[PDB]
Design an enzyme around this catalytic site. Structure first.
Site: not given
Ligand SMILES: *[C@](O)(C(=O)NC1CC1)[C@H](C[C@@H]1CCNC1=O)NC(=O)[C@H](CC(C)C)N1C[C@@H](NC(=O)OCc2cc(F)cc(F)c2)CCC1=O
Ligand SMILES: *[C@](O)(C(=O)NC1CC1)[C@H](C[C@@H]1CCNC1=O)NC(=O)[C@H](CC(C)C)N1C[C@@H](NC(=O)OCc2cc(F)cc(F)c2)CCC1=O
Lengths: 303, 303
Positions: A41, A145, A143
């Site tokens: 991703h 991931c 950040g």
């Molecule tokens: C990593 O991709 C990351 O650190 N990326 C770098 C910043 C650029 C992050 C790590 C998450 C971010 C916040 N704390 C974490 O552990 N993961 C993501 O961005 C995930 C990407 C997906 C393609 C897996 N991601 C995106 C969002 N997903 C979502 O909204 O799902 C529905 C949902 C989830 C939830 F927890 C509550 C809800 F009501 C609905 C956000 C969550 C996520 O991990």
């Protein structure tokens, strides 16, 4: 002597963390030999995340679209593939710090150290359990991931986890290093359910043994019980059913303490039924299930 | 996003741990430049420990009486002195892995990472607080003496603690790296009292803020309070008195949350007076005081 949530030393894994950048997305990669592992991703845009076709998204990208930074040095990407939900970037330079390592799928109830990373720089290290529902209770911000979980086997690092996502419950999901999610999770932004969060019964027994070895033995009662009788009470409280395998794993802790596994089950039954009455066990006012028998022995034997 | 007991990455400190042996006693040393630091009770016999004259015990020893082992390599001891309760062994070889480092006396309520070591090999890493009574709640077995506590300041390791002893309460005592004990403890086998174990009030407030940032806000009440009124209730429960310095340290957490420090004090007052009614805050059924404001910001800002 004390009992504490303890991580493995992180140094071997520190020298393996790099930064991976594709367009605007920066996250962590694991640099082992001439391969860098990261969450696929990394190729996604804000809106791609609703329903991404990774195959089509990956096809608009070449080797030169990936920025892999070890500290201040850029590595040259000479190859890429997708393995399940991980991207393997082939690089020109073999990591000179590559430790002896293995990739393992951990089972539920087993623990590992998480080296929490931002921008390919190690931030902190804490112990987690793969919970029965294939989630972890981590501390992961934007950040994080690509941060990895691991065990050390004297000299050999067993990588078991790569961080991908946060669930609504404030709880975390990711893959093994072959990119297979633990549990039913998918790398897309949709409503996803972790199942009922059951307690790891063998871990709670290990922790009650740790309490006894450390002189904390108020919760010990005059009673005993049977597997079937305890497991009827487990079920009620969303505890994993205790098996004879579980009894055998606990035997070194039984042997050291002189307390039969079934006598400890009776104590657990009355704690589950009566609560703790504002008392504490190893500085906790609740029953801890994130220590394995090995963890208890390792800490109560000094490995 | 999660909140966890988190240690610093240990790698910089791992390469500084050696084994120190004098007669039959083996423990851990800290090898920085051409000096090795260790507990002076390395020179003691089983019975010397009742009332040792370290000056006379040290006088029967020469350079060649100290075995300093970095991994499989023996170092040559070309000098020794006693600084308070630490032995400084001068060695021929400067540690090639010496990080940028400082020696600091930590204040009570501040936290550090402990790298638990046996035979000069790093075992595990966990976070501790220097408690108001100058003890720590560690996990330390026979062989752990000379294990060190430290902070990382981007690149610079701040060593603050060297492990010496266990107290009857199952609680630990040691020195800074100049060999001055934290608290009233002496390196001899006699009855020694840690004082009353008071709670670090500013740390509990930091942890209630961490709870709120992570969406856990049931314990918030409709009331407010005054410093003097809260501090009358603190006293009753063996909490450190809250000062305006403490209020100012919490301001970044107030600012981020929109909850005035004094409004959080009111919540704390009713938790102290009413208990938690079997409810939990960040997975704990008791009030946690081993997170500083910095620790909360660092983890809730991603340093
Ligand atoms: C990593 O991709 C990351 O650190 N990326 C770098 C910043 C650029 C992050 C790590 C998450 C971010 C916040 N704390 C974490 O552990 N993961 C993501 O961005 C995930 C990407 C997906 C393609 C897996 N991601 C995106 C969002 N997903 C979502 O909204 O799902 C529905 C949902 C989830 C939830 F927890 C509550 C809800 F009501 C609905 C956000 C969550 C996520 O991990
Ligand atoms: C280190 O010296 C060490 O690891 N040495 C290597 C094994 C050779 C140990 C670490 C302790 C051991 C067990 N867990 C620890 O953290 N420390 C000591 O041996 C202490 C040496 C003293 C000179 C400071 N030490 C000796 C004993 N002191 C004692 O009996 O005090 C009275 C006492 C203490 C107590 F906790 C309860 C009582 F009822 C009475 C034992 C404790 C100790 O730390």
């Amino acid at each position: 002597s004390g009992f504490r949530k303890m991580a493995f030393p992180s140094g071997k894994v520190e020298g393996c963390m790099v930064q991976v950048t594709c367009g605007t997305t920066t996250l962590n990669g694991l640099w082992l030999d001439d391969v860098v592992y990261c969450p696929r991703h990394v190729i996604c845009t804000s809106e791609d995340m609703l329903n991404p076709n990774y195959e089509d998204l990956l096809i608009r990208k070449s080797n030169h679209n990936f920025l892999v930074q070890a500290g201040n040095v850029q590595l040259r990407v000479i190859g890429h593939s997708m393995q399940n939900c991980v991207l393997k970037l082939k690089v020109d330079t073999a990591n000179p710090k590559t430790p002896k390592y293995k990739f393992v799928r951990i089972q539920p109830g087993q623990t590992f150290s998480v080296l929490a990373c931002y921008n390919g720089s190690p931030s902190g290290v804490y112990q987690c359990a793969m919970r029965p529902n294939f989630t972890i209770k981590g501390s992961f911000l934007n950040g994080s991931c690509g941060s990895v979980g691991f065990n050390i086997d004297y000299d050999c690092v067993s990588f078991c986890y790569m961080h991908h996502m946060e669930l609504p419950t404030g709880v975390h999901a990711g893959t093994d290093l072959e990119g297979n999610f633990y549990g039913p999770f998918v790398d897309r932004q949709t409503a996803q359910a972790a199942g009922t969060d059951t307690t790891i019964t063998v871990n709670v027994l290990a922790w009650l043994y740790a309490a006894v070895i450390n002189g904390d033995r108020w919760f010990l009662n005059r009673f005993t019980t049977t597997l079937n009788d305890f497991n009827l009470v487990a079920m009620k409280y969303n505890y994993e059913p205790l098996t004879q395998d579980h009894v055998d794993i606990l035997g070194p802790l039984s042997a050291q303490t002189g307390i039969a596994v079934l006598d400890m089950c009776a104590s657990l039954k009355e704690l589950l039924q009566n609560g703790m009455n504002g008392r504490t066990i190893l500085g906790s006012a609740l029953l801890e299930d994130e220590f394995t028998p090995f963890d208890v022995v390792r800490q109560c034997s000094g490995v």
